[PDB]
Design a protein around this nucleic acid. Structure first.
Ligand code: MN
Ligand code: MN
Ligand code: MN
Length: 430
DNA sequence: ATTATGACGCT
DNA sequence: AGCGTCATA
C-alpha cells in the first residue's frame, strides 16, 4: 500500500526523428518534399538497399531492408536519394552531422542520452519542477499541448482523428489536479508542455520534424513515441499501463524483440506484456536470470529504473564494409587496399572528433567475417591506437589479422573475407 | 546480397 | 579481452 514503489519519480522523454535520413535529403532537395521517397545505399545490386522511407511511400508498402527494384514494383513513382559514397564505401557523414544539429538543440533543455543517430532520451524531472514553480498553480491549457496524445483517452460515456486527440486531451486536463506539485500525472503533463517546446525548436531551427514520448521511464517513453508517429507526441501515464499492456505483444518492448522475448513467450506460454504480472519475481528470475527477472517483474507494472545517461556523443567511432557473394576479398593486396580505405575514413572522422570534442581514441578494434560464417563477426582483435594516421592504422589492422589467412602462399587470402570493420574506442580527454 | 553502424551484457 | 545480443537509419 503506502510502501509499494510505483516508479513515478521521474519524467523521461524520448525524442525520435521522423523518417530521419529522408528528411535530411528532403531539406537539401526541395523536389523530394511531400513525395513518396526513400534513401538507398548502393545501386548496382537490385537498385540498392532502402534504409529510410517517407510516410507517403510507406502507404504503398515500401519498407526499410527492401531492395529499391522491389520497392519500385509497389510504388513506380518512388523518388530515391542515394547515400554518399567515398573511398569505395557508403559514407554516413551527412546524417551524423544532421544528428548533431538536433542533439545540440535538445541539450539546451536538459542533459541528454544519445540513443541512436536520430533519437535521445531526456530526464525532464528537474525542468518540470521549475516550470511548476513559476506556473503558480495555474492550470494547463490545451493550447500548450497542440500535438499531444494522451494514451488511453478518450474513454467512457466525432469520427475525425484530430477530433479524437482533442477529446482525449480535454478528458485528461479536466481530471488533472494542478494544485499538487508532487502529482505524477501533473508532472508528466508539464513534461509534455516542455517537449512541445523542444520539438518546436527542433523544427524551427533545422526544418526536421520529430515525434516524442513522455512517461516515467525510458522504456515507456520509447513505446509512447511510436504510438502516434509522425509529427506528434504521446503521454503514457502510469495509470494507462494496465490497459496498454493487456494487448501489447511482448516483442514490442525495447530489449524483448529478440531471443529473450521469444523465450518469455515460449517458456511462460503468454503473448502480452500484461500477462507477466501473474508471475512472482523469483519465478521470472528462475527462467530469465536475476537481472532480467527483476527487470521484467517491474517492467510489466510500468516500472523501470534505468537512468538517462549524460552522454551526447557516441563513445566509439567505426567504419565497416561487407564484401558479399562474389566480391569477397581473396587476395592480400585487396584486403590491404580496403583496410586503407576504411582507415582513411576513420582518420578523417577521428581528426574532426578530436577538434570538436577535446578527446582522443586510444584503442583500435579490428573485426572481420569469414565466408561460410554464421555470425555478423567471425573474429575481433584490438591493438593500440597511438596516432591518427590512416596508413599506420591500416598496417596495424593487417598485423592483427594476418594469421587468419589459411592459404599456403601468402599472396592469396583464404578463406575469403566477407566483412572488414575498424573501430576506434577508449577515449580520453585531450 | 539489407548494410552500416553503435551500446551493453556475459564470462 | 573477445563474443553475443539487440538496437536503429
Ligand atoms: Mn526515427
Ligand atoms: Mn530512431
Ligand atoms: Mn525505424
Amino acid at each position: 500500500g503506502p510502501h509499494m514503489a510505483t516508479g513515478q519519480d521521474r519524467v523521461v522523454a524520448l525524442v525520435d526523428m521522423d523518417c530521419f535520413f529522408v528528411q535530411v535529403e528532403q531539406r537539401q532537395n526541395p523536389h523530394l518534399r511531400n513525395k513518396p521517397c526513400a534513401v538507398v545505399q548502393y545501386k548496382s545490386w537490385k537498385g540498392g538497399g532502402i534504409i529510410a522511407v517517407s510516410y507517403e511511400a510507406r502507404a504503398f508498402g515500401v519498407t526499410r531492408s527492401m531492395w529499391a527494384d522491389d520497392a519500385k514494383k509497389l510504388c513506380p513513382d518512388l523518388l530515391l536519394a542515394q547515400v554518399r559514397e567515398s573511398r569505395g564505401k557508403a559514407n554516413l557523414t551527412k546524417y551524423r552531422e544532421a544528428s548533431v544539429e538536433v542533439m545540440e538543440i535538445m541539450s539546451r533543455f536538459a542533459v541528454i542520452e544519445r540513443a541512436s543517430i536520430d533519437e535521445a532520451y531526456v530526464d525532464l524531472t528537474s525542468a518540470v519542477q521549475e516550470r511548476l514553480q513559476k506556473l503558480q498553480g495555474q492550470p494547463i491549457s490545451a493550447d500548450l499541448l497542440p500535438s499531444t496524445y494522451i494514451e488511453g483517452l478518450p474513454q467512457g460515456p466525432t469520427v475525425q482523428k484530430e477530433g479524437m486527440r482533442k477529446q482525449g486531451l480535454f478528458q485528461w486536463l479536466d481530471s488533472l489536479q494542478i494544485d499538487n506539485l508532487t502529482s505524477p500525472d501533473l508532472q508528466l503533463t508539464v513534461g509534455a508542455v516542455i517537449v512541445e517546446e523542444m520539438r518546436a525548436a527542433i523544427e524551427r531551427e533545422t526544418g526536421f520534424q520529430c515525434s516524442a514520448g513522455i512517461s516515467h521511464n525510458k522504456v515507456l517513453a520509447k513505446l509512447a513515441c511510436g504510438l502516434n508517429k509522425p509529427n506528434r507526441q504521446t503521454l503514457v501515464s502510469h495509470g494507462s499501463v494496465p490497459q496498454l499492456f493487456s494487448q501489447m505483444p511482448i516483442r514490442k518492448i525495447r530489449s524483448l524483440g529478440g531471443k529473450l522475448g521469444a523465450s518469455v513467450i515460449e517458456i511462460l506460454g503468454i503473448e502480452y506484456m500484461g500477462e507477466l504480472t501473474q508471475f512472482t519475481e523469483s519465478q521470472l528470475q528462475s527462467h530469465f536470470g536475476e537481472k532480467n527477472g527483476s527487470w521484467l517483474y517491474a517492467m510489466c507494472r510500468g516500472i523501470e529504473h534505468d537512468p538517462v545517461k549524460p552522454r551526447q556523443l557516441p563513445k566509439t567511432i567505426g567504419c565497416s564494409k561487407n564484401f558479399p557473394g562474389k566480391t569477397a576479398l581473396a587476395t592480400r593486396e585487396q584486403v590491404q587496399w580496403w583496410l586503407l580505405q576504411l582507415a582513411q575514413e576513420l582518420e578523417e572522422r577521428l581528426t574532426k572528433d578530436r577538434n570538436d570534442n577535446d578527446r582522443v581514441a586510444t584503442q583500435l578494434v579490428v573485426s572481420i567475417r569469414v565466408q561460410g560464417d554464421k555470425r555478423l563477426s567471425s573474429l575481433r582483435r584490438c591493438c593500440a591506437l597511438t596516432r591518427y594516421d590512416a596508413h599506420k592504422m591500416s598496417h596495424d589492422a593487417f598485423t592483427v589479422i594476418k594469421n587468419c589467412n589459411t592459404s599456403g602462399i601468402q599472396t592469396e587470402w583464404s578463406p575469403p573475407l566477407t566483412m572488414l570493420f575498424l573501430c576506434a574506442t577508449k577515449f580520453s580527454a585531450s
